[PDB]
């Protein structure tokens, strides 16, 4: 049983790291997609000048 | 002689109407480009939205 509890603690640590890394990967996709509109705005500011 | 002086007075007045008409035409022309710049700015705010 104490061996099982040890597998359960390793498993919980894996659970936490998996989803912290899925959020970490998600944020970079959101940042990459948010950048394109800023590029369009800056280019069109040039046309304003 | 007063006939000639009146003639030249009307001619100088007409030249001043060239100064005024050309000034108005130039101001009108620059306003259109101001509108073009604000159209770019307005659709830039749309892209920011």
Set out the fold topology:
This is part of a larger assembly, with 2 copies of chain A (49 residues).
Chain A (H helix, E strand, L loop, with lengths): L1 H47 L1
Explain what this protein looks like in three dimensions.
This is part of a larger assembly, with two copies of chain A (49 residues). Chain A is an all-alpha fold. Chain A has one helix spanning 2-48. Chain A contains one helix and no strands. The longest helix of chain A is centred in the middle third of the chain and has 47 residues, at 2-48. The N and C termini of chain A lie far apart (73 Å). At the A-B interface, helix 1 of A face helix 1 of B. It is classed as toxin. Keywords: Bacterial toxin, Tc toxin, toxin. The entry is titled "Photorhabdus luminescens TcdA1 prepore-to-pore intermediate, K1179W mutant". Chains A, B are TcdA1.
Summarize the structure.
The structure is cut from a larger assembly and holds two copies of chain A (49 residues). With 49 residues, chain A is an all-alpha fold.
> DSSP helix count of chain A?
1
Helix content of chain A: over 70%
Largest sheet of chain A: none
- The SSE order of chain A reads H
Instruction: Give the C-alpha Rg of chain A.
Output: 22 Å
Q: Largest interface by residue count? A: A-B, 7 and 7 residues
Sheet/helix structural class of chain A = mainly alpha
Report how far the terminal alpha carbons of chain A are from each other: 73 Å
> Proportion of β residues of chain A?
under 5%
Total beta strands of chain A: 0
What coarse outline of chain A follows from CA principal-axis ratios? rod-shaped
Oligomer: part of a larger assembly
PDB class: toxin
Keywords: Bacterial toxin, Tc toxin, toxin
Entry title: Photorhabdus luminescens TcdA1 prepore-to-pore intermediate, K1179W mutant
Chains A, B: TcdA1
């Amino acid at each position: 049983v104490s061996q099982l509890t040890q597998f359960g603690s390793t498993l919980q640590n894996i659970i936490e790291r998996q989803d912290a890394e899925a959020l970490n990967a998600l944020l970079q996709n959101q940042a990459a997609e948010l950048i394109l509109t800023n590029l369009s705005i800056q280019d069109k500011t040039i046309e304003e000048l | 002689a007063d006939k000639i002086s009146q003639s030249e007075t009307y001619r100088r007045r007409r030249q001043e109407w060239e100064i005024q008409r050309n000034n108005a035409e130039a101001e009108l022309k620059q306003i259109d480009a101001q509108l073009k710049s604000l159209a770019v700015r307005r659709e830039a705010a749309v892209l920011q939205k």
